[PDB]
Every structure is written in structure tokens, then in C-alpha cells.
Amino acid sequence: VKDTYTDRLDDWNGIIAGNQYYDSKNDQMAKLNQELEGKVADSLSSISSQADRIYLWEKFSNYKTSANLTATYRKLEEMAKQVTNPSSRYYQDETVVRTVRDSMEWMHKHVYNSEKSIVGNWWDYEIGTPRAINNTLSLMKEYFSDEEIKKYTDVIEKFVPDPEHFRKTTDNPFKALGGNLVDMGRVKVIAGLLRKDDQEISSTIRSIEQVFKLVDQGEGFYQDGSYIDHTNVAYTGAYGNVLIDGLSQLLPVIQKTKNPIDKDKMQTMYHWIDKSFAPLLVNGELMDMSRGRSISRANSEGHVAAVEVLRGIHRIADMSEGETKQRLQSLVKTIVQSDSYYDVFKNLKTYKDISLMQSLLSDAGVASVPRTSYLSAFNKMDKTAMYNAEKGFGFGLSLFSSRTLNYEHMNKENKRGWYTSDGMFYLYNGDLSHYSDGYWPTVNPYKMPGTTETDAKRADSDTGKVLPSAFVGTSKLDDANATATMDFTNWNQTLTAHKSWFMLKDKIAFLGSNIQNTSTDTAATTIDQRKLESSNPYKVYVNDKEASLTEQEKDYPETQSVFLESSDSKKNIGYFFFKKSSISMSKALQKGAWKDINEGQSDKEVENEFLTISQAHKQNGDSYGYMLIPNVDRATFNQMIKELESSLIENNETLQSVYDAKQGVWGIVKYDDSVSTISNQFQVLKRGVYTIRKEGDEYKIAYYNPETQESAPDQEVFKKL
């Protein structure tokens, strides 16, 4: 019968299938459909149409392998989508309808029911299979009796009776938290409706609400926008993804129920979008430092992953109403339009999503202006993201500490991310493809950009750990100026070094001191390992004289600066050394296959050319000091190098500081509570991080103690002279 429940199921259908939105007029939709058509075809031709069939399909015959149960039901779902798409050749095809109805019965009888026990992977019996069944039944609720629907969904309540636990039928049930909670909604909320059971519906939602909180310790979203999962790993870009992407999928339904979700919880979602996600998106790209082991998945590079997030943000905008709706539509649209490298539509798997995007993209009533500058200090996850709207570039600083793991290596994924958190920095510029197109399987992992390491070999079997020090953090003065530090010690404890970064509106200063080494291995810092474009070659200038780099390596003593020039200034990169340094450089072809960094990935050889710039550290107590200036031409780069003449205030074992005369801003890092005098203007008294701007005779002070994670009174840390 047609009631309020079916109303919710039609919305659900609208979100999963959306045959109502169909339009054979964009390769995207016609493709997806053209694909299912084929799939339903070979599925109907390969099915076992016998009276004593021992299974339904030979490719997924052995039902002791749970993956086979899930796959089987998924073909039925694919049949369910087409049989209800007016444009499909199988639209209302009695053979298909009969096939599903009969396939469901057979399965219910001989393979998946309340009588069986989990054999193989619980995930299949509890999430994978139940989903396919809900969507198949929801989609074809017009070809199924209510009585039948209860019958085929009884097994779901068997393996998944409680909206707070998974594996309640195994000898190790666990509490559903964060991400899996969305699956819980996908499995119970839906069957709740299918069964017209208000309690299951209300219970599940009440439980889904667990995730609508902000936290101050452990897994979850933080007030500064950080997001932690798997105990202490920064994960906004993957597990954070599935939370806003999957949840945006359920919300529309939840709200039109008798159990809407509190408005104070919705406003939190909003806080996540503006505080957690937005800042991690640069030029259609989701910054890798937040994606964890996902960087090693060939099918999930930066721009591709950015789409999971945006399509989620869009779902929220679509269901929001006031300004909120509009300001989010602008966010999605300006960001989508800023990505000239990746076709957003290649990663929109549902007709509704594709539809929503094509409408947004062509609505003029939705302003679409390039985003303004911003600087996020995700101190709760040791990462900083900077974006200068003026010159068009992004900056990612990837750290870790006693509160966070340096890198995740599990399930044979990200086998070589040893140093992607040992001070790694990301520069997002004119080349939107830099961190894609085989970057990960071909980049030299022993030389991650910005890190300080020894040439000791690392094992593919290693796993990450936390840092000994709690002294890692960032002080944000404004949206353009900030300072960060990391009391670094290497993975095997044979090297320490004070690493500091000074983000100053249109450039960042890199400082390292107290470099010590107790191993026999040689130590050096990677100034950069940049992935080059064959189309856009670079011309290199060392001390403003052109140089011809080698595959091998040339040493450049008394180096004052290095300039990587492009025919496009948005891709230009310059390096200024406050003190002439001895660096080495090279340019060579690096080959690697995704399998080397991820077992389940392709062994197909990949290759890219890279420009590597390094500085060796031969004696104890060494240091490095350079300013990275992106997006300006050689003449402007050479002028600015004349301006930052005395920008280096100090770089020693207790104090590191850079001064921007142009802005009247100081970036200071103190490792002790000694009295330090800066520019003969003031003194700073306490161990910590400062970012200071002189406003007339005043001084705006941003102070932060990374160990206690709190600020302090100006009197306590600063003194005018």
C-alpha cells in the first residue's frame, strides 16, 4: 500500500537510482546506463536457469566465500535499477522481474537467511548483502508484496538486530562508531521503512546521531576542524570523506521522517564543511596529507577523492534552505569550476548527483567567485593548510607528534609512507596534476619534500609510530600569517633537528637547526622533489645563471638561490637561501608500479621525471635556511630576494625567527624560557610559537604553546622595549 513509508522509499530510490532524473544526453548518464544495460545483459545470459540449480551464477558459486553472496545480490540490484528505468530496454520486462523475484526466493531458501551463521566475512552478511537487498526491494517495491518484503528482510534483522553493534552474532561484537554508523543507517533505516517499523527507524537514527558531536580527544571532528580516526591518525580526507559522503546520502530521508535530526546537530555538519573540508580543497584537489593510506590507491588520487567530498557537500546544500543552501552552492560551484584538470562528472556515480551538478554549473543565480585566502591550523591533527587567493597557490605542511601517527600502513596499503609526515610540505600551483598521474608510485619515498632523514634503508613491512615530543604546533596570527614547529626525531632515533616553518602571505620560510646524527648513515634534507610535465619543461637558474641539470647529481656550492622557470608564472618556483648553502640537484626519470606501494594495486610500470634538490648535513649541529616563493617571475623573484636581505632574525638551537619588513610581521619559535630580543624592538619570554604584527605603536600577538595546546597573556610571553 501507498503510505508515508513508501514516500521515504521513493526518496531513497531517487537518491540511489533516480531514474526520474534520467537524460540520455550527457555521456555521464547515458554511459552509466549503457553500462548497466550490458551488465544486466550478461547477467541474464549467464544465470543458471535450472530446477535443481546448485547456485545462481558460476562465477560466484561457492557461497562459503561471503564475497559471493554480496556479488550475487548486487546483480539483482543492477537488474532492479534497469527494470525501473523508462529508458532501459528492460523497462518493465517480465523476464527480469520474474528473474529477481525468483532469484531472491532461491537465495532466501538455499543461501542467505536467519538460519545461517556468518561464514567468511561478517561485513558481507551484515553490510554488503543487506544493502543490496534493501535497495533491490526498495526499488521494486511495486513488484513485491509487503508480506514478501518482511520475509526477505528478516535475515537482515537476524545478523543486525542492534543499531549500536556489529557482529552481535559473532564472538566479538563491537560498537558501531563514526563511519560504520552510516552503513548502519543504510542497512537498518532502510529496512526500517521497508518493514514499516517505526522503532527500528527511530532507534537507528538516534544512534546515527552519535556522529553529530565535536570531540576534544580521540576519533572524531574537532573544534579547530581536525578529524582523527583509527585512534590517532589524521584522516579528514578518507574516513572523514565517507562520513559526509555517506551521511549526505541518508539525511534527506531522515529529515522527512517522524524522527528528524535536531537542528543543533545539523549546524555541526556545517561546521565540519567550513572548518574541516573546505580548507583541504585546493583547485579541485583534496590535499593528500588528510587522505591516509588512500594516496596509494590508483583509482583515488586527489581530484578524484575531492569529488566524494563535494558531491556530499552538494547533497547537503540541496536539502538545506536559507542562505546556508546558497552559500554552499557557491562553495561547490566555485571549487568545481576552479578544476581545469579533472572532469568532476567522471566521479559522480548516480543520476541525481550528475543532474544536480549540471544544474548548479549552469545556474547563474549562484555566484561563483574564486575563494579568498585562508590559513587553517589543524593543531589537533598536526597539519596546516594555507591558501593565497591573490597569487593562486596552496601550501600543505604535514607533521605528526606524540598525539598522532606519522603514517598508516595496513592491509598492505601505503607500504612506503615512512616520511610523509616528517615535515613534508605540499605546494599546489598552476600544475593541477603534480600529485596525480603516478606521483605516488614513482616519487622517491626516501626523499619526501621538506623532510630531514638519513640514507638508511626502510622496510616495506614497517608501520608508523607517534613522535616522542609533544612540541609540534602552529600559531596563526591571521589568514595569511602563521608559524609552526616540530621537535623532530627520526624513526630510529639517530637524528634530531628543530624544524620550523614561517608562512608569510605569499611565501614560506623553512628553518632547521640543531641537526644531530648518531648513526653512520649520511644525513640530508630534501628541499624538493618535484614531478615535472613533459609539456611544460622548466628552465633552472642557480644564482640567476642558467644550469643544465643531470640525471646523476651536480653539487652547487655557495648557492644563494635556485629558480624553476616556466612559460606560465603560476608554476614558477623560487628558493632563496638566507645564507649561501651547498646543495645538490638532479633531474631524472623515476619508475615505479602502484603494486610496490599497495599489494592490491596494478604492477604496471609507471614513470615520471623528477627534479630533486637536497642539502647534505655532514657535522653535528648543522642547519638549513631558505624561503620558498611560488608564482612570480624571475625579475620579481630577484627583486624580492633583495628585499628579504635581513629577513632572517635567527636560526639556532633555542630560537628561530624570520622577519617580513614589508608586512611588519615576525615569525618566532622559542625552545626555552630564556629572554630573547627581537629586532631590538621587543623581547619574548616563553618557550613556544609566536606570530607578531606591528600595528603602529602596538603589536598584535598570536602565541601558542604546542605542548599544553593553549595560548597565554601578552604580558606573560611578550615585552615591549
Catalytic residue among 108, 165, 230, 271: 230
Count the alpha carbons within 13 Å of 620 in the hemisphere toward its beta carbon: 8
Q: Return the ∠ at Cα 316 (arms to 182 and 4), rounded to 5°.
A: 70
* 3 state SS of 702: strand
DSSP 350-372: SHHHHHHHHHHHH-TTS---PPP
The per-residue b/e assignment along 537-569, b for 16 or more CB within 10 angstroms, e otherwise, is ebebbbeeeeeebeeeeeebeebbbbbbbbeeb
CA distances from 129 to 35, 79, 208, 244 (A): 22, 15, 20, 23
Least Cα distance to 422 among 465, 482, 456, 376 occurs for: 465
Q: How far is CA 143 from CA 125, 138, 573, 713, in A?
A: 24, 10, 62, 70
Round to whole Å and give the CA distance between 574 and 638.
Answer: 9
Lay out the sheet containing 698-704: strands in order across: 648-651, 655-660, 665-670, 688-695, 698-704
Q: State the catalytic residue, choosing from 13, 85, 180, 608.
A: 180
Q: Identify which of 25, 24, 22, 26 has the alpha carbon closest to the alpha carbon of residue 343.
A: 26
Q: How far is CA 615 from the centre of its chain?
A: 30
C-alpha cell at 169: 552474532
Hey, is 640 helix, strand or coil? helix
CA distance 142 to 151: 16
373: DSSP letter: P
CB-neighbour burial class of residue 321 (10 A; exposed 0-12, middle 13-18, buried 19+): exposed
Element (H, E) at 639: helix 634-643
Q: What is the SS3 assignment for 421?
A: coil
* Catalytic residue check, 62: no
Q: Check residue 401 and report its DSSP letter.
A: B
DSSP percent split of the chain into helix, strand, coil, nearest 5 = 35, 25, 40
Helix residue ranges, H only, 86-189: 94-110, 122-123, 129-139, 146-159, 180-184
- Give me Rg for the CA atoms of the chain: 28
Grid look-up 641539470 returns 549
- The secondary structure of 526-565 as a DSSP string is EEEEEE--SSS--EEEETTEEE---SS-EEEEEEEEEEEE
Cell 532507534: give the residue.
203
Cα dihedral 24, 28, 29, 35 sign: positive
- Resolution in Å, one decimal place: 2.8
CA separation for the pair 278, 538 (Å, rounded): 31
* Strand, coil or helix: 631: coil
CB-count burial class (<10 Å; 0-12, 13-18, 19+) for 532: middle
Query: In three state form, how does the secondary structure of 165-189 look?
Result: EECCCCCCCEECCCCHHHHHHHHHH
704 contacts 720 by C-beta, under 8 angstroms? no
User: Could you tell me which residues are beta bridge partners of residue 521?
Assistant: none
Residue 152 grid cell: 526477505
The SS3 assignment for 505 reads coil
Distance CA 692, CA 660 (A): 10
Q: At what angle do helices 129-139 and 67-82 cross, to 10 degrees?
A: 20
Distance CA 662, CA 219 (A): 41
Distances (CA, A) of 613 to 424, 451, 564, 610: 14, 12, 11, 10
C-alpha cell at 329: 552552492
Distance CA 200, CA 190 (A): 10
Q: How many other C-beta atoms are found inside a 10 Å radius of the C-beta of residue 349?
A: 13
With residue 38 as reference, give the H or E element that holds it: helix 27-46
Structural domains in the chain, sorted by start: 1-373 (1.50.10.100), 379-635 (2.70.98.10), 636-721 (2.60.220.10)
Per DSSP bridges, beta strands 285-286 and 281-282 are: antiparallel
Count the Cβ atoms, other than its own, within 10 Å of residue 300.
18
Spatial CA neighbour of 426 closest among 464, 383, 389, 463: 383
**3-class DSSP state of 657:** strand
Q: What is the largest CA-CA distance in the chain?
A: 95
Beta bridge partners of 659: 666
DSSP element (H, E) containing 681: none
Round to whole Å and give the CA distance between 646 and 110: 80
For 99, other C-beta atoms within 10 Å of its C-beta total 22
Residue 535: CB atoms within 10 Å: 8
Residue with cell 601517527: 405
DSSP tag of 705: B
Rounded to whole angstroms, the Cα distance separating 484 from 279 reads 17
Q: How many residues does the chain have?
A: 721
| 615: number of Cβ within 10 Å | 22
Dist. CA 407–CA 424, nearest whole Å: 12
* C-alpha separations of 386 from 35, 106, 222, 610 in Å: 41, 57, 19, 24
Q: What single-letter DSSP state applies at residue 170?
A: T
Cα dihedral 399, 401, 403, 406, rounded to 10, equals 60
Other C-beta atoms lying within 10 Å of the C-beta of residue 49 = 9
Whether 239 is catalytic is yes
* Contacts of residue 400, Cβ cutoff 8 Å, sequence gap at least 6: 234, 382, 406, 407, 421, 422, 466, 467, 472
The owner of cell 530446477 is 51
Q: What's the CA dihedral at 249, 250, 253, 256 to 10 degrees?
A: -110
- How large is the angle between the packed helices 129-139 and 94-110, nearest 10 degrees? 140
Task: Look up 434 and say whether it is catalytic.
Answer: no
Q: 324: exposed, middle or buried (C-beta count within 10 Å: 0-12, 13-18, 19+)? A: middle
Nearest to 561 by CA among 502, 623, 645, 478: 645
- Report how far Cα 311 is from the mean position of its chain's Cα atoms: 14
Bridge pairing between strands 622-630 and 508-517: antiparallel
DSSP-assigned states of every residue in 272-326: HIIIIIGGGEETTEE-GGGSGGGGG-TT--HHHHHHHHHHHHHHHHHH--SHHHH
Distance from C-alpha of 576 to C-alpha of 632, rounded to nearest angstrom = 13
Calculate the CA dihedral of residues 251, 256, 262, 265 and round it to 10 degrees: 10
> And the C-alpha cell for 491?
624513526
- Are the CB atoms for 641 and 685 separated by under 8 Å? no
CA separation for the pair 146, 142 (Å, rounded)? 10
- Sign of the CA dihedral 319, 320, 325, 329? negative
Closest CA to 479 of 376, 611, 594, 561: 376
110 burial (CB, 10 Å; 0-12 / 13-18 / 19+) is: middle
Question: Which DSSP string corresponds to 45-96?
Answer: HHS---TT-SSS-GGG--TTSTHHHHHHHHHHHHHHHHTT-TTSTTTT-HHH
Q: In Å, how far are 8, 12, 18, 32, 229 from 28, measured between CA atoms? A: 27, 21, 14, 6, 34
Q: How was this structure determined?
A: X-ray
Count CB-CB contacts under 10 A for residue 603: 8
CA distances for 204 relative to 81, 158, 463, 617, angstroms: 26, 15, 36, 58
Closest CA to 287 of 93, 426, 445: 426
What is the C-alpha to C-alpha distance for residues 586 and 720, in angstroms, rounded to an integer? 47
**DSSP for 198-234?**
HHHHHHHHHHHGGGS--BSSSSEEBTTS-EEETTTEE
Q: Which one is catalytic: 152, 235, 239, 342?
A: 239
CA distance 117 to 88: 38
Cα 403 versus chain centre, distance:
19
How wide is the angle at C-alpha 455 spanned by C-alphas 453 and 457, nearest 5°?
A: 110
Closest CA to 505 of 310, 662, 320, 358: 662
Q: Distances in Å between the alpha carbon of 449 and those of 186, 397, 430, 501, 531? A: 41, 10, 18, 13, 11
The sign of the torsion formed by the CA atoms of 388, 393, 398, 403 equals positive
| H or E element that contains 675 | none
Q: What is the DSSP letter of 436?
A: -
Q: Which three three-digit cell numbers place residue 429?
A: 600551483
User: Pick from 506, 662, 540, 509: which is nearest to 611 by CA?
Assistant: 540
* Residue that has been written with the C-alpha cell 535497495 in this structure: 135
Amino acid (one-letter) located at 458: R
